[PDB]
């Protein structure tokens with residue numbers, strides 16, 4: 299019989315999620331109940347999976363396909379059948395995937411690099427211009443960077459977040475504007491492919507209504523999880539000075555020019571390890587949902603019926619001691635020295651299979667470029683001895699994380 303947490307009469311397990319930190323609560327429950335537990339609400343049921351041994355089965359695309367969780371069904375009210383909130387069987391999913399994938403590879407990443415540097419330089423200038431004893435609000439500045447970068451690299455649109463105190467402000471006029479601005483403009487960017495690319499399979503381009511949903515989808519998915527990653531990784535860096543020393547040394551040895559080239563970002567191997575170890579501990583889109591395509595038995599013991607939902611709790615997967623060793627709470631980038639050594643389906647911060655994160659290379663190239671520049675240009679201090687406090691929205695972020703940065707005075 300499947301483990302299940304405490305209940306609340308006819309509300310079953312629902313009130314367990316009446317908390318501003320539901321994924322953290324679910325991790326505690328998984329630590330209590332193990333690799334799988336049932337979670338019941340009035341009218342619905344799901345099973346939360348935490349072990350590599352079960353999650354590797356869940357990731358078998360012949361048996362399970364992406365499900366839209368509760369949260370995603372609400373997000374679909376405004377992101378529609380854009381890539382993130384479409385079902386795999388909806389015609390617009392594979393069509394858009396085919397149209398947009400060439401935008402997110404590599405020839406593409408070289409073409410985005412210069413506009414990424416545009417926004418990263420604005421970040422570094424902001425910090426160079428701080429006076430003595432002022433501090434940095436980390437998640438806030440990371441979000442200014444990530445929003446501006448997806449806006450510029452993807453849509454040639456400047457949110458100008460660094461010119462603002464309060465985050466950028468609606469959605470329709472913005473979308474309307476991004477489109478109008480482009481009609482009136484010559485780019486080769488994400489919005490280019492949205493407007494002119496044809497799916498080689500169907501021969502069709504995206505229609506107007508789905509183009510609007512994709513812009514909404516990318517503006518959101520294109521920045522919040524990346525802000526969270528950069529913020530957690532700066533937190534782990536300031537809590538682990540020897541790691542910061544190694545990363546800062548690599549940045550100094552590698553970034554020998556006033557601004558980084560694409561090739562130099564790729565050479566930041568140890569920065570790439572640090573980012574993956576942050577993704578291990580706090581994967582910023584921490585859960586994804588699947589449904590059973592047909593009746594099937596999980597782990598030889600848990601029969602599922604067609605349409606049964608499962609949730610992958612990624613932070614708990616990333617703490618599976620049978621895979622990672624006993625020291626899973628420790629921050630050790632050396633875990634990622636050779637990505638080949640990581641067992642299949644043990645590390646899934648970008649989801650799974652054909653429904654995996656389309657933006658993974660973009661996010662990693664942005665994050666590595668920016669952290670490299672941060673580490674080249676400043677020494678950082680955890681002046682408040684900050685206590686990790688993780689705020690949950692769609693994503694995860696270290697709320698109130700602040701540091702001081704002292705400039706190495708290296709020309710930019």
Ligand code: HEM
Pocket residue numbers: 364381382383395448515516519520521523524527577581582583585586587646647648649650652653654655656657658660661
């Ligand atoms: C440039 C930044 C990013 C962009 C533009 C982006 C975009 C997207 C899109 C459009 C999808 C849906 C893909 C599809 O199903 O066809 C997706 C999926 C996903 N992304 Fe990203 N993403 C970005 C960064 C990130 C980061 C930093 C993380 C995690 C640390 C992340 C984690 C995920 C996960 C876990 C999924 C699968 C979600 C699910 O299965 O329901 N993404 N992303």
